[PDB]
Write a protein that binds this ligand. Structure first.
Ligand SMILES: NC(=O)c1ccc[n+]([C@@H]2O[C@H](COP(=O)([O-])OP(=O)(O)OC[C@H]3O[C@@H](n4cnc5c(N)ncnc54)[C@H](O)[C@@H]3O)[C@@H](O)[C@H]2O)c1
Ligand SMILES: NC(=O)c1ccc[n+]([C@@H]2O[C@H](COP(=O)([O-])OP(=O)(O)OC[C@H]3O[C@@H](n4cnc5c(N)ncnc54)[C@H](O)[C@@H]3O)[C@@H](O)[C@H]2O)c1
Ligand SMILES: NC(=O)c1ccc[n+]([C@@H]2O[C@H](COP(=O)([O-])OP(=O)(O)OC[C@H]3O[C@@H](n4cnc5c(N)ncnc54)[C@H](O)[C@@H]3O)[C@@H](O)[C@H]2O)c1
Ligand SMILES: NC(=O)c1ccc[n+]([C@@H]2O[C@H](COP(=O)([O-])OP(=O)(O)OC[C@H]3O[C@@H](n4cnc5c(N)ncnc54)[C@H](O)[C@@H]3O)[C@@H](O)[C@H]2O)c1
Ligand SMILES: NC(=O)c1ccc[n+]([C@@H]2O[C@H](COP(=O)([O-])OP(=O)(O)OC[C@H]3O[C@@H](n4cnc5c(N)ncnc54)[C@H](O)[C@@H]3O)[C@@H](O)[C@H]2O)c1
Ligand SMILES: NC(=O)c1ccc[n+]([C@@H]2O[C@H](COP(=O)([O-])OP(=O)(O)OC[C@H]3O[C@@H](n4cnc5c(N)ncnc54)[C@H](O)[C@@H]3O)[C@@H](O)[C@H]2O)c1
Lengths: 278, 278, 281, 279, 281, 279
């Protein structure tokens, strides 16, 4: 099994939600923590909270869409603790509405965080991990939206399908390369976190000047209800994720009840049948 | 059935491969053609060839990764022919190698063309089509790599999974919106085209200064053999695609033999089983 | 076999369709190209692209219905390359509709290009080829419309039957005169080209003041549909034509499926039978 | 049964050969005659003889290659007799020799008469006939040279193949348009007429300045010999032609012996076999 | 019930762990906060974040083992808010290892914070609270180690049994003196805090020149593991503690699962039985 | 069976009360005696009387709150008799009154003797005993006040609960380390000794300048009354203690009647019930 005690975990999106939960779980297993977030206030508060729980932790404000900042995060992790054993490419954002009503900025924002942030983390940290000649593991947070295509969330859906596939490919590439570095793919259903309020960290350069359309308002309200009503919490997702890492299990479906809907989409494809609305 | 005679088709990646084949097929059905490509020479030659076959056609040099140029393409199409009835968001590029060995530029290049080009086309042309109150259809070229995750092609794979999902979502959004605009998703296996030589149109700003790694060289050689040995040609893909448009069929699998491998990946997911190499 | 590499081909109608495909095929075999067309824009693009791919090519704007301009085309050919070995009398136009509804200008236009253009080509270039004491060959583009008489195409049909018989006669005349110059007759069915848009190169002096009739409109639209949906392309016509030249075969029927209805017309004649009605389209 | 008594026939080339014989046969059937030829002296000899024998006949000098004059021929026909029921687009000329040795003027001359003269007649008279709502018929004189490609006659051959196909198409077009206007295609072999001396009516603007070549002289000598030695006369051709019109028969082959040579040509095409010389 | 909104809480050890959680809970109830700690950096961050979320709070660096500084903390409390209603004598440290291997400095350090800090708190603030004629309450943090005697923790155990009994006695003394001041005794099991890292705030004068022994290393690592893996958090301890204060309940056992082994120790004593060996960890 | 003849006992608080009685009992068992007290006059009276009766005994004035002096006590013990087999960390003091009314010096005094004196003894002597590879035993004098929390005695109570738990932990630690060193915990109720007059040995540095409060005077009067009226004597406590050492019994409750009150306190804790006043 994968051992955690005294190892180093780097966690993006650590100021909230799953990322904060991963930090708490990692601390309880004896991990040293490198926490990264673009939300300065959330990051600072999470660092202080983890320290008050006895964790050894540093924080590095990081916009994961920026390759130079992700490199800087790795450099900070090595300077502090010498090694990186666990990477959670977890930061994410969303936007909704009829697909054609979204702006170019919306596409750039969501793909910059949800895909390029994951890409940067893999590109920067996998060589470091491969060079250490020790067990290490990379966990990428997708979503059940990486296995399904629900209406009015097409940009988010597409970004999460990209994370699914790049992480599947990563699994094969790491094996073909050899070594003790593995990876997993986390695909949760809705959990009460801050994800429905992702607009709070949209960068100024990507703001929309147009007011939200009717379908965008509807999608935003829908996501809030879905998020607020999830029956598993972020703490449960952290527990299940670390169990999967210990077993080096690739697919982490925290809400396996979704599998009926996933099977439906897969059946559409195998039957070359126009997409079913369930 | 969808009628083509006298209608207007806008085709990206028209200078080669599937795009040139779509232009020839469209011309044989009586369509007016708006051809777009970033490769100036290929675009000009394709325009001349189609004209020598009696087609009514214009060409617009277009980098589909650039939203302003995709808008300009729509403006040129309307100025020439007044309407757009068929859109082929078809331009694409690729890169390969162990996932972490690829550069940030590689990610930006492939996602800029394969995802943002599709996104721009949907964003710009779907409102035009919805406003015409006539039948229209949008075809997005993914790949079987949008349904599978083969090793050493992770960036390409991820971009094509994104196209799959955004197009599935588009299908639902168009229905929820109402109207006569539909869409389809084209997922071919390997076909002898120019796709293995996509580096010919990598923009200067995204060039790699480092020489290719061992795995990148291997992946490039593998793709060339796969592409050169495909048993269906681009003309066959065009024929099958237009048949699907006529029936408004969403999933266009030109090589349905792939479905055994697709089922294998779907089984991995449904069973939460680590990815199988077939 | 007939040698192409290093030889000189003169092609009329080279801006589009078959002529352009002949030029591409000739270039791929190493021929020097003299390309002629009245559509200066199309001709310039054809020449430019062939030259950029490495051809030795000149383009000469030529109205093949004009005897002096055909003579000027031969002069430009000889001035650029010294010889002419292959001549494609290929430019052509068309018009349709009930035969009596067409104008005198329609007859003059179609026959000026389709018959007189071929006639000038033969008259000007055959003596040049005979005087060279070298293998040479003349290919005239007729049509399956030179072997059949489909309705509402009578002016075009008549011009193509004229090309058929003049070329058949040339075959015998060249053998009677003796020497190494031969000829072939190309008779394709519908192929995607610009031929249904021939009005774009009708000269202003032969324009029709009158509005087109119902039967003329119907013939135009039927021809547009038939041409654009042809299953063989201009490239295929060029490939088959050069194969025939190589073996000096006279009849080039690129679409042999036409033979059932050619046989029907022949048996009408042989039985003195009133022409069998064509099937519905 | 197409009926002739009291109907109006327009005949081109009426001063000689087939045209004169059509006129004499039409007169014997009680037709009113409108006779056209570019040769005014020969046209007058035909008209005056028929008028002396009691026919209703007018003569109109006409160059059938000139559309304006063909229109005036129709105008005179309608002015005199009110209707046109039978049209013989019959005037014709020829030239011979190795194909490439002929001049541009040779092409323009032979096609002007043999094709454009027929085209003008169809263009001018077919709408008249269609508008009359009566039985009418157009006869175009081709030749067996419209069915075969004999050597050294390429311009003539090509002109006659054009007549063959335009008349076949006219047959289909008339049926598509509907009505009682029909047509026939006359394809005779050599008959002793004046056709071998067609140069007598070559217009000045199309004169050749060069002397004839060996092959042109050879082709002229062959034609003179072949025309002189036909066993059927112009009267016989007229008899057979009106016989076929009566039955509305399209192909009029006055010399059916040539069909063996026609089958050979057709077989060449059907087999894509290099043209066989029948020797 | 005990009223919190608008009342004044003084919390020692407020920079981390339970103390920080008490301050957060007090802020959420509308209490004015006087927060004390010797870890100036941790205390400043705690105060800053609470104030930014809207608390009325002051932070006062205080070494609770120093009687004068505890008196200074009361003076700062009264100067800022005029009253003290709730006192959490909560700061604490620890050391482990075989009892005889610990130094005199180890005893002085642990007892100075864990016992004397509580003693100074009671001595300084109880008279203030009694003189106010208002409801007030003192909460002393002991531990389940004040109810049990686990091996290799004897100095810490002893200090926490001292807190237990002094607080039990204070309960009776406050009732005998009369009035509205009460007290409670908080006895948690392991919770993720900084308590296993207490060496970070050992004063320089009480440092050990000697290397740590095998049994001291083992005790430190066991404590690190037990603390970090506690299933209840500091927030939960704060929630349960304030619920107990509200009902003025004396014993606060946040981890009642400890009761089986507390009963075992009690029956050892009641039966005059040699202490039952603890189970393997 | 732990054996006493010829073994060495170190006894703190040897000038009075339990400590003097331990010394007399040890002498009767043939032990060599190392006697310590901060009161030099009382220590000399004990030492000289025992020596007169034929014991091997030395006296070492010792303030057990001072680690250096406890070390010197061990040094003198080893110098005179070579070994230490029995240690009574017995010296103790007290103070009373409402908890918050006591001074900082009261806390420092009572904990200095009652807890630090015991801690110093364990720290200094346990490694000696462990290194001897012989049977040895440490006895710490707590009180029933280490098992209960009677009102107005909070400083004393807390100090004695600390002794209880440190000695229980010592019991577990000695077994974890291995060897033949053990310990016991002596928990007597009130006995007529000098404990109610402990202020006679309060060091000058910890003097109170304030006069006593009503509750402190009340607590002093109660203690004087309770101590004077115990029915067991110091000799009896010494008898019971050596009896328990012989059996290696840990809990030494010389007054088992208090266990009803102890069960009540234990029940309070087990039920999380506000402390019951036993009245
Ligand atoms: N919560 C759910 O229901 C749900 C379901 C499935 C998947 N997910 C995914 O889980 C991941 C974690 O999100 P969450 O639910 O904890 O939401 P969250 O909002 O509570 O936390 C996400 C964090 O990412 C940070 N972040 C955003 N953009 C960033 C950037 N450019 N650089 C660095 N940090 C950035 C935010 O500031 C925030 O602290 C995301 O990838 C999300 O898409 C969430
Ligand atoms: N050929 C296959 O085996 C295969 C299989 C599955 C999917 N596909 C997809 O089919 C689509 C068509 O590719 P193809 O196989 O015809 O390859 P191709 O190389 O023959 O044609 C692709 C064309 O896209 C153009 N293009 C590239 N970047 C562009 C940009 N930024 N803007 C505009 N045009 C741009 C290229 O210049 C080229 O003409 C692509 O999306 C490709 O990923 C191909
Ligand atoms: N395309 C078919 O279906 C088809 C079938 C049978 C025969 N044909 C014959 O093939 C030949 C080539 O035509 P295509 O189909 O390639 O059509 P096209 O329109 O593509 O090419 C014919 C070219 O001839 C040129 N041309 C016309 N008049 C001219 C003149 N006076 N002088 C010089 N050039 C002139 C036109 O500009 C044009 O570029 C013609 O003779 C046509 O009748 C075509
Ligand atoms: N005689 C044969 O052996 C023979 C065989 C087959 C077909 N034909 C055809 O039969 C038709 C009749 O010829 P014929 O044999 O009676 O020859 P012919 O010379 O005896 O008579 C033809 C007449 O047409 C006239 N003509 C010539 N050019 C004219 C013009 N521009 N306008 C008006 N009239 C004009 C001539 O003056 C002459 O009177 C011709 O079309 C000829 O091609 C003749
Ligand atoms: N965490 C547990 O498992 C646990 C269990 C039972 C009891 N306790 C008790 O809980 C109390 C709070 O500790 P915690 O667990 O929150 O640990 P902690 O280390 O997170 O917090 C204790 C705080 O006390 C401060 N402190 C230490 N010495 C001080 C001094 N001289 N003056 C002022 N402040 C001082 C430290 O700086 C620290 O901020 C302590 O009394 C501890 O013994 C803790
Ligand atoms: N007597 C009781 O009722 C009673 C009950 C329970 C427990 N105890 C405990 O029994 C132990 C013995 O007390 P006692 O009852 O014999 O009282 P005691 O007064 O008769 O004797 C105690 C002796 O300890 C000495 N001493 C005090 N401070 C000292 C120091 N700093 N260093 C060295 N010696 C010092 C005193 O001088 C005195 O001689 C104490 O720990 C006391 O707390 C007594």
């Amino acid at each position: 099994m994968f051992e955690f005690d005294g190892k180093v975990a780097v966690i993006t999106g650590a100021g909230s939600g799953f990322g904060r939960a991963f930090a708490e779980k990692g601390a309880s297993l004896g991990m040293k923590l490198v926490l990264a977030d673009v939300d300065e206030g959330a990051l600072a508060r999470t660092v202080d909270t983890l320290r008050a729980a006895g964790a050894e932790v540093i924080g590095v404000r990081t916009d994961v869409s920026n390759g130079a900042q992700v490199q800087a995060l790795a450099d900070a992790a090595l300077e502090a603790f010498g090694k990186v054993h666990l990477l959670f490419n977890n930061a994410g954002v969303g936007a909704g509405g009829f697909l054609w009503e979204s702006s170019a900025n919306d596409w750039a924002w969501v793909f910059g965080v949800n895909v390029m942030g994951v890409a940067h983390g893999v590109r920067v940290f996998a060589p470091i991990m491969l060079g250490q000649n020790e067990a290490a593991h990379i966990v990428n947070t997708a979503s059940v939206a990486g296995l399904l295509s629900p209406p009015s969330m097409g940009i988010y859906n597409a970004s999460k399908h990209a994370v699914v596939s790049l992480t599947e490919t990563l699994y094969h590439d790491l094996r073909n390369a050899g070594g003790e570095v593995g990876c997993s793919l986390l695909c949760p259903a809705f959990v009460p976190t801050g994800i429905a309020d992702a607009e709070r960290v949209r960068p100024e350069a990507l703001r929309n000047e147009a007011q939200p359309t009717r379908s965008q308002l509807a999608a935003d309200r829908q996501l809030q209800r879905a998020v607020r009503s999830g029956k598993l919490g972020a703490t449960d997702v952290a527990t299940l994720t670390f169990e999967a890492i210990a077993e080096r299990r690739f697919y982490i479906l925290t809400h396996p009840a979704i599998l009926a809907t996933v099977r439906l989409r897969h059946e559409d494809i195998e039957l070359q049948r126009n997409p079913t609305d369930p």
